[PDB]
């Protein structure tokens, strides 16, 4: 805390949870029809039959194998929790962002204690030790050093915000095509049909 402030997000975590719940409810109760107009209700097995038609498999495969498919789906969801919890280095990409931000802030707050070719990193010591003539030179040196530090920080932040924007655009496209509908693109919404 030396002039650096962190601002809160506009959308709180509960609101994002409520969007996620709304999207899930629309998917499970209406199908793919709530992203392209008013939502229309449809039973879940019929929706899954429509999706099998979409991947090129007839309807008979689903209705004559309903229990087996339901069991496989339930087992997969069950194993997802264990797979995520067992591996510690699973959510590494998100941790990289916070770690890089912390490193940048810490480097910035550390560079206040570098003499930068001056007598001392404490300005009060500089002022109450010598005359205004040399004080001008020392203060100018410190000002140039800290201005360069700030410029570096801001440029790095912009470069990283560019990448985060690209990832956000990709996530939006995935939400619009993978969640609000069915994708024929290969290796986009998973490894498989």
């Amino acid at each position: 805390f030396n002039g650096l402030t962190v601002l809160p997000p506009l959308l709180t975590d509960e609101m994002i949870a409520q969007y996620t719940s709304a999207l899930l409810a629309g998917t499970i109760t209406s199908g793919w029809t709530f992203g392209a107009g008013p939502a229309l209700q449809i039973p879940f097995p019929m929706q899954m039959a429509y999706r099998f038609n979409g991947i090129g498999v007839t309807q008979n495969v689903l209705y004559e194998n309903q229990k087996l498919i339901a069991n496989q789906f339930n087992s997969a969801i069950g194993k997802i929790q264990d797979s995520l919890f067992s591996t510690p280095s699973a959510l590494g990409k998100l941790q990289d962002v916070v770690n890089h931000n912390a490193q940048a802030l810490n480097t910035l707050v550390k560079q206040l204690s570098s003499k930068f070719g001056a007598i001392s990193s404490v300005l009060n010591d500089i002022l109450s030790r010598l005359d205004p003539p040399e004080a001008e030179v020392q203060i100018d040196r410190l000002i140039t050093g800290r201005l360069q530090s700030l410029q570096t920080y801001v440029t790095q932040q912009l470069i990283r915000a560019a990448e985060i924007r690209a990832s956000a655009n990709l996530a939006a496209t995935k939400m619009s095509e993978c969640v609000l509908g069915q994708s024929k693109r290969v290796d986009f919404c998973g490894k498989g049909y």
Partner: protein, 265 residues
């Protein structure tokens, strides 16, 4: 601010330091008591306005401070915006973003107009004044799911939407000699000792310049040949006159194109 602490120093230590450099703690040389040093509260003094064309009332949002402190420091004189405070009373609200003075917290909820922070937005409503509220995410619509219920449409609507996208930016070029050493024969000789910064600046600018033309060529020149519509006749009933060229005015554009060209400056 020097508050009481509970750190257990060792008998030979004087100060204390945090993870970076800062003097978090200190020990008084006389009474030999640990004292925690916490920095003075500071932040932004952001301003909320509905529009000078509409009104003149404002609200002020202090970021990341306990309304209590502000008020305390409002009393006496400790703050440094020096605004004599934008009007007090039953108008000091404490939100997760900070301390808001000039608006009243209602219990209603509708679409956000001016974001403030956390769930808190502000607007100008009805006499009429600035109010602050918690954002509403939209209505609640429970779909009638059932084991044997389906819904089928019986009519359709043809809709036309608009999307806008940038394609190019202005091409600029800069000359070092005129910028830095303006019309001076005694400054140029002192620039040759700083190396070859100028050649790479010019290279970067030229690269941006050629990329600007590559962008337009890639976006627009997707047709090998130029096609022309016939003497415009019955397209089945669809009009199309608002998007096709109009051969009755210079620059041969179309009415929507003319409106677009007459609104961007």
């Amino acid at each position: 601010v020097l508050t009481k602490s509970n750190k257990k120093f060792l008998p030979f230590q004087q100060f204390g330091r945090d993870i970076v450099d800062t003097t978090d703690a200190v020990r008084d040389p006389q009474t030999l008591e640990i004292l925690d040093i916490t920095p003075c509260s500071f932040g932004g003094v952001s301003v909320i306005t509905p529009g000078t064309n509409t009104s003149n009332q404002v609200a002020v949002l202090y970021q990341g401070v306990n309304c209590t402190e502000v008020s305390v420091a409002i009393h006496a004189d400790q703050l440094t915006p020096t605004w004599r405070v934008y009007s007090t009373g039953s108008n000091v609200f404490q939100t997760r973003a900070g301390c808001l003075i000039g608006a009243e917290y209602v219990n209603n909820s509708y679409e956000c107009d001016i974001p403030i922070g956390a769930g808190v937005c502000a607007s100008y409503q009805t006499s009429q004044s600035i109010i602050a509220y918690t954002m509403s995410l939209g209505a609640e619509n429970s779909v009638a799911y059932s084991n044997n219920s389906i819904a089928i449409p019986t009519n359709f609507t043809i809709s036309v939407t608009t999307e806008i996208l940038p394609v190019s930016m202005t091409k600029t070029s800069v000359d070092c000699t005129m910028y830095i050493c303006g019309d001076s024969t005694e400054c140029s000789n002192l620039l040759l000792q700083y190396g070859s910064f100028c050649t790479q600046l010019k290279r970067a600018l030229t690269g941006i310049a050629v990329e600007q033309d590559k962008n337009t060529q890639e976006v627009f020149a997707q047709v090998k040949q130029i096609y022309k519509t016939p003497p415009i006749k019955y397209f089945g009933g669809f009009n199309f006159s608002q998007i096709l060229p109009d051969p009755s005015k210079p620059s041969k554009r179309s009415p929507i194109e003319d409106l677009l060209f007459n609104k961007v400056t």
